[PDB]
Amino acid sequence: DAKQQETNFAINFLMGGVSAAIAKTAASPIERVKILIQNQDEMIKQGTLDKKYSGIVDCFKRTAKQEGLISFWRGNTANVIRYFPTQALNFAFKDKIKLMFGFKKEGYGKWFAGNLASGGAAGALSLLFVYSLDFARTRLAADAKSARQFNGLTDVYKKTLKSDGIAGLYRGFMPSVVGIVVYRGLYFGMFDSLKPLFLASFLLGWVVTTGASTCSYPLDTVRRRMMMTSGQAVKYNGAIDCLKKIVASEGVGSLFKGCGANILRSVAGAGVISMYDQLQMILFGK
Ligand SMILES: C=C1[C@@H]2CC[C@H]3[C@]4(C)C[C@H](O[C@@H]5O[C@H](CO)[C@@H](OS(=O)(=O)O)[C@H](OS(=O)(=O)O)[C@H]5OC(=O)CC(C)C)CC(C(=O)O)(C(=O)O)[C@H]4CC[C@]3(C2)[C@H]1O
């Protein structure tokens, strides 16, 4: 029944995309609010933004009043598409990389280092095909009417390639990869430590997710702000250079802009994926 297995894997893959699509679409408005607050200083420099966002509520109000309600899903297609090339790469190469750099968990230290190498390589290899979509997501979520900078998703690609080339599409690759490693190490480290300590299960997952993402957030900020420099006259000479200039100009706190908005996005995604699981449990067997 190899053919039946092939059909099973095919249905599992496609329906997985649907689950991911709904989850990301549901928490899409809060996601754009995060991206707006996070890269507002870049917009102010570019002249796209008039005044700094006073907060999450202020971001919601201004965006809704100036652009509308549908504008909160601007860039969402990138998140929808990104599933298939990611998971295809996931199901193909992730296990081999784990078999290449991994050590049996039954020493913790050697397993920890192995997980970083495996997670880093898998993340980087996936980003080679994926990163362009995340870039377009951020840029579409960023450009606003004061006269939009980009007409659409594919418009981003055309204008970025015409100005910077393929390099412009991969702005902030290094701090993204490092971010993946740091996030993963923090995730697994925190999870195993709090493991011996369902509502309890859901709360546990939220704590680890919040902690790991918060500490690795400055890396995410630098990544997104480097995406903003694509097609612009002035650009940072690296993530470290970007990091240095941010602190010297706006302070350390500027690296954590939109962090709280990101936490809200997390509980929204986790929330709606649980709801859909129950809905899926009723319609389909699994
Ligand atoms: C610098 C940063 C900050 C820290 C690292 C990343 C993630 C958190 C990194 C996170 O990275 C995820 O971490 C998970 C837990 O370790 C890991 O799961 S696990 O391996 O099974 O344990 C995922 O691997 S995967 O094979 O299932 O897909 C991995 O996603 C990827 O590696 C795919 C890449 C295309 C990203 C994915 C992601 C997420 O929020 O979940 C995502 O892309 O949605 C990132 C958001 C952006 C930042 C935020 C990046 O800007």
Curated annotation (Swiss-Prot):
ADP binds at residues 82, 94, 223. GO terms for biological process: anaerobic respiration; heme transport; mitochondrial ADP transmembrane transport; mitochondrial ATP transmembrane transport; transmembrane transport. It catalyses: ADP(in) + ATP(out) = ADP(out) + ATP(in). Solcar repeats lie at residues 7-100, 110-197, 198-282. It is found in: Mitochondrion inner membrane. The keyword Acetylation does not apply. It comes from Saccharomyces cerevisiae (strain ATCC 204508 / S288c) (Baker's yeast). It is a multi-pass membrane protein. Monomer. It holds the Pfam family Mito_carr. ADP:ATP antiporter that mediates import of ADP into the mitochondrial matrix for ATP synthesis, and export of ATP out to fuel the cell. Cycles between the cytoplasmic-open state (c-state) and the matrix-open state (m-state): operates by the alternating access mechanism with a single substrate-binding site intermittently exposed to either the cytosolic (c-state) or matrix (m-state) side of the inner mitochondrial membrane. Present with 1080 molecules/cell in log phase SD medium. GO terms for molecular function: ATP:ADP antiporter activity; identical protein binding. The transmembrane helices are not perpendicular to the plane of the membrane, but cross the membrane at an angle. Odd-numbered transmembrane helices exhibit a sharp kink, due to the presence of a conserved proline residue. Residues 223-228 are annotated as: Important for transport activity. GO terms for cellular component: mitochondrial inner membrane; mitochondrion. The gene is AAC3. A motif (Nucleotide carrier signature motif) lies at residues 223-228. This is ADP,ATP carrier protein 3.
